[PDB]
């Protein structure tokens, strides 16, 4: 995020970190949508121009986090991926159309003050909230600057 604030504790309890096993480090954001389902951008998993091509065994999801770098003991839960899915019509070649992937966790995550799922929109909530000029909120541990 460029030009944002520090989140407050508990502010975004569905915020997930995709974390690389191989050289241990942040891949991407993601979001917790049930006790076993995490949602992310397909391009975090598969993006050929960039050699980005990750499987289950390359990835940990880290849920409950505030700090980017530390292992938040007693607060975070680290899960392992059972099954990754990428939209079949995901256009990585052109314009990243349908940039979405579902990640299924091995064991359920237990909810807490710091870990809790976001809702997914119904047609009607989309219908009334998805309009020009209505504000939305984005959250992440990505670069503060371009470079």
């Amino acid at each position: 995020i460029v030009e944002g604030s520090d989140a407050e504790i508990g502010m975004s309890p569905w915020q997930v970190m995709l974390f690389r096993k191989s050289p241990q480090e942040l891949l991407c954001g993601a979001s917790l949508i049930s006790d076993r389902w995490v949602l992310t951008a397909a391009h975090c998993l598969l993006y050929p121009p960039w050699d980005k091509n990750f499987t289950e065994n390359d990835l940990l999801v880290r849920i409950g986090k505030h700090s980017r770098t530390r292992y938040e003991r007693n607060i975070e839960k680290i899960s392992m991926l059972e099954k990754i899915y990428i939209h079949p019509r995901y256009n990585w070649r052109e314009n990243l159309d349908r940039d979405i992937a579902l990640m299924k966790l091995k064991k359920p995550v237990a909810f807490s003050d710091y870990i809790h799922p976001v809702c997914l929109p119904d047609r009607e909530t989309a219908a009334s909230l998805l309009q020009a000029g209505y504000k939305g909120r984005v959250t992440g541990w990505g670069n503060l600057k371009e470079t």
Binding site: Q24, E25, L26, L60, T69, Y71
Partner: peptide, 10 residues
């Protein structure tokens, strides 16, 4: 800069 995470997570 990423603090080592427990070994139990393989």
């Amino acid at each position: 800069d990423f603090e080592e995470i427990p070994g139990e997570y393989l």
